[PDB]
Design an enzyme around this catalytic site. Structure first.
Site, PDB file in Angstrom:
ATOM      1  N   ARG A  17       1.051  10.677  -8.419  1.00 46.24           N
ATOM      2  CA  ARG A  17       0.555  11.279  -7.184  1.00 46.24           C
ATOM      3  C   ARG A  17       1.456  10.801  -6.050  1.00 46.24           C
ATOM      4  NH1 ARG A  17      -5.013  12.402  -6.602  1.00 46.24           N
ATOM      5  NH2 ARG A  17      -6.163  12.784  -8.558  1.00 46.24           N
TER       6      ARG A  17
ATOM      7  N   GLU B 185      -7.688  -3.814   1.471  1.00 46.34           N
ATOM      8  CA  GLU B 185      -7.875  -3.814   0.032  1.00 46.34           C
ATOM      9  C   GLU B 185      -8.008  -5.147  -0.700  1.00 46.34           C
ATOM     10  OE1 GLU B 185      -5.283  -1.023   1.168  1.00 46.34           O
ATOM     11  OE2 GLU B 185      -4.600  -2.875   2.106  1.00 46.34           O
TER      12      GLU B 185
ATOM     13  N   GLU C  80      -7.181  -6.115   6.927  1.00 45.34           N
ATOM     14  CA  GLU C  80      -6.450  -5.167   6.114  1.00 45.34           C
ATOM     15  C   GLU C  80      -7.496  -4.340   5.360  1.00 45.34           C
ATOM     16  OE1 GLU C  80      -6.045  -6.090   2.282  1.00 45.34           O
ATOM     17  OE2 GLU C  80      -7.959  -6.862   3.069  1.00 45.34           O
TER      18      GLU C  80
ATOM     19  N   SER D  51       1.093  -6.746  11.168  1.00 48.81           N
ATOM     20  CA  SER D  51       1.814  -5.594  11.697  1.00 48.81           C
ATOM     21  C   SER D  51       1.265  -5.066  13.020  1.00 48.81           C
ATOM     22  CB  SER D  51       1.826  -4.458  10.673  1.00 48.81           C
ATOM     23  OG  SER D  51       0.526  -3.924  10.497  1.00 48.81           O
ATOM     24  N   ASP D  52       0.180  -5.661  13.500  1.00 44.20           N
ATOM     25  CA  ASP D  52      -0.395  -5.241  14.769  1.00 44.20           C
ATOM     26  C   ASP D  52      -1.485  -6.197  15.235  1.00 44.20           C
ATOM     27  OD1 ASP D  52      -3.277  -4.068  14.320  1.00 44.20           O
ATOM     28  OD2 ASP D  52      -2.064  -3.321  12.627  1.00 44.20           O
TER      29      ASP D  52
ATOM     30  N   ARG E 163       7.464   1.675   0.443  1.00 45.04           N
ATOM     31  CA  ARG E 163       7.818   0.271   0.602  1.00 45.04           C
ATOM     32  C   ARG E 163       8.135  -0.287  -0.778  1.00 45.04           C
ATOM     33  NH1 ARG E 163       3.823  -1.771   3.910  1.00 45.04           N
ATOM     34  NH2 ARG E 163       2.754  -3.253   2.520  1.00 45.04           N
TER      35      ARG E 163
ATOM     36  N   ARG F 243      10.021  -1.533   6.184  1.00 43.24           N
ATOM     37  CA  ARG F 243      11.175  -2.422   6.025  1.00 43.24           C
ATOM     38  C   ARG F 243      11.534  -3.251   7.275  1.00 43.24           C
ATOM     39  NH1 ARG F 243      14.884   0.149   9.856  1.00 43.24           N
ATOM     40  NH2 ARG F 243      14.300   2.367   9.821  1.00 43.24           N
TER      41      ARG F 243
ATOM     42  N   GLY G  85       0.825  -1.191   0.000  1.00 45.08           N
ATOM     43  CA  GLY G  85       0.000   0.000   0.000  1.00 45.08           C
ATOM     44  C   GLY G  85       0.863   1.247   0.000  1.00 45.08           C
TER      45      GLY G  85
ATOM     46  N   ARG H 237      -0.499  -8.557  -3.804  1.00 51.81           N
ATOM     47  CA  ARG H 237      -0.474  -7.513  -2.799  1.00 51.81           C
ATOM     48  C   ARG H 237       0.398  -7.986  -1.647  1.00 51.81           C
ATOM     49  NH1 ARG H 237      -1.956  -4.072   1.047  1.00 51.81           N
ATOM     50  NH2 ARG H 237      -2.978  -5.145   2.806  1.00 51.81           N
ATOM     51  N   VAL H 238       1.392  -7.182  -1.290  1.00 57.05           N
ATOM     52  CA  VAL H 238       2.279  -7.511  -0.185  1.00 57.05           C
ATOM     53  C   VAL H 238       2.074  -6.388   0.821  1.00 57.05           C
ATOM     54  CG1 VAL H 238       4.011  -8.873  -1.422  1.00 57.05           C
ATOM     55  CG2 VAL H 238       4.156  -6.407  -1.503  1.00 57.05           C
ATOM     56  N   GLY H 239       1.087  -6.589   1.687  1.00 58.33           N
ATOM     57  CA  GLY H 239       0.767  -5.581   2.678  1.00 58.33           C
ATOM     58  C   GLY H 239       0.863  -6.041   4.117  1.00 58.33           C
ATOM     59  N   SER H 240       0.316  -5.216   5.001  1.00 58.84           N
ATOM     60  CA  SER H 240       0.309  -5.490   6.426  1.00 58.84           C
ATOM     61  C   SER H 240      -1.134  -5.632   6.890  1.00 58.84           C
ATOM     62  CB  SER H 240       0.969  -4.333   7.164  1.00 58.84           C
ATOM     63  OG  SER H 240       0.303  -3.116   6.864  1.00 58.84           O
TER      64      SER H 240
HETATM   65  O1  LIG Z   1      -5.215  -3.480  12.028  1.00 50.61           O
HETATM   66  C1  LIG Z   1      -5.370  -3.104  10.868  1.00 50.61           C
HETATM   67  N1  LIG Z   1      -6.669  -2.796  10.428  1.00 50.61           N
HETATM   68  C2  LIG Z   1      -6.987  -2.388   9.127  1.00 50.61           C
HETATM   69  N2  LIG Z   1      -6.000  -2.256   8.187  1.00 50.61           N
HETATM   70  C3  LIG Z   1      -4.715  -2.546   8.591  1.00 50.61           C
HETATM   71  C4  LIG Z   1      -3.538  -2.523   7.834  1.00 50.61           C
HETATM   72  C5  LIG Z   1      -3.232  -2.224   6.442  1.00 50.61           C
HETATM   73  O2  LIG Z   1      -2.412  -1.037   6.468  1.00 50.61           O
HETATM   74  C6  LIG Z   1      -3.041   0.080   5.814  1.00 50.61           C
HETATM   75  C7  LIG Z   1      -3.575   1.103   6.856  1.00 50.61           C
HETATM   76  O3  LIG Z   1      -2.728   1.180   8.019  1.00 50.61           O
HETATM   77  C8  LIG Z   1      -4.153  -0.489   4.939  1.00 50.61           C
HETATM   78  O4  LIG Z   1      -3.666  -0.486   3.578  1.00 50.61           O
HETATM   79  C9  LIG Z   1      -4.418  -1.901   5.475  1.00 50.61           C
HETATM   80  O5  LIG Z   1      -4.465  -2.922   4.484  1.00 50.61           O
HETATM   81  N3  LIG Z   1      -2.509  -2.895   8.692  1.00 50.61           N
HETATM   82  N4  LIG Z   1      -2.990  -3.168   9.955  1.00 50.61           N
HETATM   83  C10 LIG Z   1      -4.343  -2.955   9.875  1.00 50.61           C
HETATM   84  O1  LIG Z   2     -14.724  12.482 -12.583  1.00 47.92           O
HETATM   85  C1  LIG Z   2     -14.306  12.133 -11.493  1.00 47.92           C
HETATM   86  N1  LIG Z   2     -14.843  10.982 -10.839  1.00 47.92           N
HETATM   87  C2  LIG Z   2     -14.431  10.498  -9.574  1.00 47.92           C
HETATM   88  N2  LIG Z   2     -13.435  11.183  -8.897  1.00 47.92           N
HETATM   89  C3  LIG Z   2     -12.907  12.301  -9.516  1.00 47.92           C
HETATM   90  C4  LIG Z   2     -11.910  13.162  -9.047  1.00 47.92           C
HETATM   91  C5  LIG Z   2     -11.103  13.206  -7.827  1.00 47.92           C
HETATM   92  O2  LIG Z   2      -9.808  12.749  -8.266  1.00 47.92           O
HETATM   93  C6  LIG Z   2      -9.348  11.556  -7.593  1.00 47.92           C
HETATM   94  C7  LIG Z   2      -9.298  10.358  -8.553  1.00 47.92           C
HETATM   95  O3  LIG Z   2      -9.029  10.774  -9.900  1.00 47.92           O
HETATM   96  C8  LIG Z   2     -10.287  11.298  -6.438  1.00 47.92           C
HETATM   97  O4  LIG Z   2      -9.501  11.541  -5.259  1.00 47.92           O
HETATM   98  C9  LIG Z   2     -11.459  12.274  -6.620  1.00 47.92           C
HETATM   99  O5  LIG Z   2     -11.648  13.138  -5.508  1.00 47.92           O
HETATM  100  N3  LIG Z   2     -11.752  14.149 -10.044  1.00 47.92           N
HETATM  101  N4  LIG Z   2     -12.598  13.931 -11.124  1.00 47.92           N
HETATM  102  C10 LIG Z   2     -13.289  12.806 -10.773  1.00 47.92           C
END
Ligand SMILES: O=c1[nH]cnc2c([C@@H]3O[C@H](CO)[C@@H](O)[C@H]3O)n[nH]c12
Ligand SMILES: O=c1[nH]cnc2c([C@@H]3O[C@H](CO)[C@@H](O)[C@H]3O)n[nH]c12
Ligand SMILES: O=c1[nH]cnc2c([C@@H]3O[C@H](CO)[C@@H](O)[C@H]3O)n[nH]c12
Ligand SMILES: O=c1[nH]cnc2c([C@@H]3O[C@H](CO)[C@@H](O)[C@H]3O)n[nH]c12
Ligand SMILES: O=c1[nH]cnc2c([C@@H]3O[C@H](CO)[C@@H](O)[C@H]3O)n[nH]c12
Ligand SMILES: O=c1[nH]cnc2c([C@@H]3O[C@H](CO)[C@@H](O)[C@H]3O)n[nH]c12
Lengths: 237, 237, 237, 226, 237, 226
Positions: C43, C181, C179, C203-204, C24, C217, C20, C87-90
């Site tokens: 972004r 996603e 998590e 991670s928690d 990383r 890391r 995420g 996906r390699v997340g936490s």
């Molecule tokens: O305890 C938790 N709850 C929900 N998400 C996360 C995560 C992950 O980390 C990010 C938010 O901290 C998210 O991308 C999610 O997938 N790590 N630990 C947790």
């Molecule tokens: O036409 C659209 N649709 C959905 N989101 C957006 C956005 C904004 O841009 C980001 C994704 O492109 C989002 O964070 C959202 O707030 N701009 N234009 C649009």
């Protein structure tokens, strides 16, 4: 001849009594019908056709659950010309004033199943029985000195509910008996233009005692069947 | 003895193969299990226990629909020490590249039932099978030289659905087969602490045509059985 | 170039590991990929492409939440020929027998998001990973001598949920990690015809305490990476 | 007195006929009831109590919609001892065989409201009438040489629905008439342990048909007393 | 110091402007604030604190999506004493009379996300902005000769909707702009007792043409920021 | 004339003040309007049109609940050219700081009704008022030396809710007052392209406060005309 019934048009009466247990259908056939013949045996769901006081009647199990009975009642209606279906089963009671062996007639059926929402654009479809079938049953019971209760049944998807918090709710809104297919049958009857009714005998209740005798229990179950059989004769008139 | 199974602890093996049809269970016991003895017939839901290559194993029907199999898988897990459940059923295909007789392994199972939402506070619970069981089944297959796709099954409540547009949705998301109990068995397995897997034989095609009577016994329906039985052996090692 | 990725067809490998955190991804490119070159920073969502044991491979962040990763996984699949996403997340643990640093493989993913219901006509779509990818990851693990549980993850929309009672529900149904996603990536993979797998490092602990800065890391976060990278190699054979 | 009914226990009969239109309560009091007296006027929702062939009976409107009728139904039941509620109103039809002026009796009532789901833990509550009351209405209509259809009603929350596709669905599942409060009243009766029934005359797809409905309703109560 | 922000109380102003793009926050900091300092860099979500006309202001990206911005705004409010949050982003238009570069102020925000239903017992929570913040913005825009539109925004979970049938609906019920987090921010502001407002500049529209110049586009985006910055000064009075 | 309003285009002003109670429309016509004339009486839901400081204005009740107000709101808008609707009524409070008689303005309205979900494909539609109308009401109250709270309202379908646990939730998310139609009116305004606003006085947790609200409402229209 459908994937679940190996019979042909004419093999069933235009009225079918349906217990959930296939072995119960054979019991009904052998106990109340004369000149009975097995008309189906696919996956063990025994069906029979015979006559009750000269009237042609069929009896077949529907299995446990809305999904099961939905398959059978649908095929009977659309592929075998069945016009009326009467479910004859058991149910559990949640109301304090509803006692063991009470005969309950589900004029309506509540459910936690999603079949009717899928049918009704996600709104509330009131799954009800055919009015005339209900009054025929009420009158037949009266002729037998059996007074039945008419109201709402609850058709559950989970016999073993993960959270019995729903039983207080059922009690609160006055449902008479808890079973598993009434709401499904009524949904099918409405969808394919037929008439259905389910009658139940209270076999258990929340907050038990002793156990009641099998003889008396079996007696009430037979009365329920007689009520069912006799109610169709009243409809014929 | 439970409400729907007249058996005692020990009459069932810790692994039970379960087709929806009671007669198929009878066929499996007669054709695959050595020294098979019948352990149940309550509502005609035949259950048998015998051995396969020295391994003690049982086979019993679970009826049609999630409500039905939920009752049986539950009583088996809580009152008969059953550790594993392998559903060996049939299904409908929706994808064009899926022919009749094909064997499908459901690692996952989508559903239109409300049963899992009732368990998972109205959120999305991913009804999945036990990983090792899926791998055992895939390996058993390769060792028998039988093809088998691994993926999502869709457990339907209505065999005769009023929403045919949903088949397009299923197909789009590549669901392998339409059956009626996988998602319910996985929910029970999780709720009651057991493991489960569903193996199905494509017995018909939603877009094309079906089949009949072979569902109770066919070499391809025999392949499903061999895979199931052999995968158990691999699981024991 | 897509709305969120300033790259051209060919700048990404057919396999992309995705944490995420953008930083990383940078760490993974610097620590594991030979000759890594940056292919995106629109972004701040860093993307890199290099080689691992001669195998061309990419790594890029997907941000937090299903809406974020849905954007990236989608553009990658439709405009950059990406075939696999890992996906390699936490994540957060809810079960007592799950310690920090443990590696979890999500064969399935529950969710409280409405995203999949919007795709599956408000029914239950079982968000599952590609079977072979799960097996590759399990084998890679064993070959590296690293433990790893395979099961259900829960993809939450709110990291700070107002409903803590849901953790009890998750735990009851044995979800391995919380998590944000996985269920969304699996839905995209299915909707757009690609394959995906989610690997997470605990991670928690939801019931106990967390950790900090190591998420970008740590050797255990390095184990997740090795498994992911090695599983790809097994997939190529 | 309750928030919406300035009266005391005893002022209302144990049975209450409820038209939607407030103006119709007074017309019913003067036309069918004997020795009627005014028992409510809080928001112009006039109520009256008198007798029909010696039988004590009350009349008072409930307003349009489930939220409105739910208020009056609940108050009458919990604070004035009302045991039975008979709604008498109009409805629209979607079935070809159902003709204008037909008399429809709602054994059950479907709805697009969330009211009962909120009551039934988001499950499906079959909003139904009391069987005896249904049968009494049917027998009373017969005795008056009138044919009454008994089936499902549909209680719409939006008189002007943004999607007409739902009317095809209603026709497909055989609902007899479209109105706006039956399911609401049935929910309340269930929740507070009382009986209810709604009778409707098809207005679209009059005083005579209307008088016929009230006669049916009133005559059904006497049958119910037997 | 939270798992997503490496700063301490005092490091942020009690008012934070929030673009979705971390790189946009640095842009705002360097363009309108004096004596700006980076106060966070975790996972690349750059945050800055400085002064605008002597007033202490903070600016930090929130990432794309309700789940992402929900984490940041929540921590800012509960862990850094932030009282006001102003989202400054882009949106797409569905109404014919709403043209490119129009400044839209979301007094309300519709959504297809489930976060607020989870918060509101499954009912309809109207996600609205703080009234005073809205009027401050309207007045500031007026002082700059910029007339803004005040109405409903739609916060989508899926930027790439599986079925654009929802765009006609949005148009029908008059939503001014389509974005991805307003409904999430408002839910958070309501839950933890803070005040929030989101202002958007229409960057695209359904039924395009030419492409408009970047200079004019960038000019309007700067006006939006000035409106935001200036509206808080009006609130201070 | 529409199904619920026996009148013709022109009879109603482009702005309509709507109290719940029908009896209050006439009281408002005689007390605040000049040269008022009766323009409706279909179900006792009296409507009047006159002027306030030269400005043309109409008054007519909407009944209790979303289903009821939705009918009148829709008809006035699509058949009588009404451009703005101001509901003036009462509400209950759940917040400790909100006192009886406080004047609350609903910038937004939450609800337990399915009405907007049916409109918004089962998603979350933010039922909101028109900003200018909100600001006008606020400025008018100020000029009258009255403090008005601006926030969320909650439109209940069940005045007598089976679960009181929801009131804790309303308090937690800061809703200012509990009533029964704001979200319904806002939905209609959105659906048919018109503007709406509901102003309420806290009745529980009077003529003066009520007169204050109407004055505020009326004075807000003149501000809106600038
Ligand atoms: O305890 C938790 N709850 C929900 N998400 C996360 C995560 C992950 O980390 C990010 C938010 O901290 C998210 O991308 C999610 O997938 N790590 N630990 C947790
Ligand atoms: O036409 C659209 N649709 C959905 N989101 C957006 C956005 C904004 O841009 C980001 C994704 O492109 C989002 O964070 C959202 O707030 N701009 N234009 C649009
Ligand atoms: O207490 C009960 N609960 C749920 N179902 C039943 C039944 C009926 O028995 C079967 C399951 O035991 C179902 O087919 C159902 O109709 N009897 N008693 C009960
Ligand atoms: O096309 C189909 N649709 C739905 N279920 C099935 C089945 C299975 O067979 C039984 C009903 O025929 C159920 O138990 C179901 O799992 N086979 N073919 C199909
Ligand atoms: O066609 C119709 N649709 C919806 N409601 C009704 C009604 C009744 O009239 C009132 C609204 O016009 C409601 O109270 C409802 O009971 N009559 N005809 C219809
Ligand atoms: O405490 C309350 N709860 C719900 N509604 C109201 C009302 C208003 O009064 C009428 C019902 O009593 C509704 O039309 C509603 O707008 N005032 N006070 C309350």
């Amino acid at each position: 001849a459908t994937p679940h019934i190996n019979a042909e048009m004419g093999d069933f009466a235009d009225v079918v009594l349906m217990p959930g247990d296939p072995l119960r259908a054979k019991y009904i056939a052998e106990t109340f019908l004369e000149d009975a013949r097995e008309v189906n045996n696919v996956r063990g769901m025994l069906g029979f056709t015979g006559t009750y006081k000269g009237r042609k009647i069929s009896v077949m199990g529907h299995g446990m659950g809305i999904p099961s009975c939905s398959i059978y009642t649908k095929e009977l209606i659309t592929d075998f010309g069945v016009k009326k279906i009467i479910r004859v089963g058991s149910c559990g009671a949640v109301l304090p004033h509803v006692k063991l062996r009470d005969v309950v007639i589900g004029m309506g059926a509540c459910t936690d199943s999603k079949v009717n929402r899928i049918r009704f654009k996600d709104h509330d479809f009131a799954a009800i029985a055919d009015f005339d079938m209900v009054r025929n049953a009420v009158d037949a019971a009266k002729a037998l000195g059996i007074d039945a209760r008419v109201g709402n049944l609850f058709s559950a998807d989970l016999f073993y509910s993960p959270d019995g918090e729903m039983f207080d709710v059922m009690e609160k809104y006055g449902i008479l008996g808890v079973e598993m297919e009434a709401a499904g049958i009524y949904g099918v009857a409405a969808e394919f233009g037929a008439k259905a009714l389910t009658i139940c005998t209270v076999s258990d209740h929340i907050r038990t005692h002793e156990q009641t005798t099998a003889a008396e229990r079996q007696t009430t179950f037979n009365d329920m069947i007689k009520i069912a059989l006799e109610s169709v004769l009243l409809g014929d008139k």
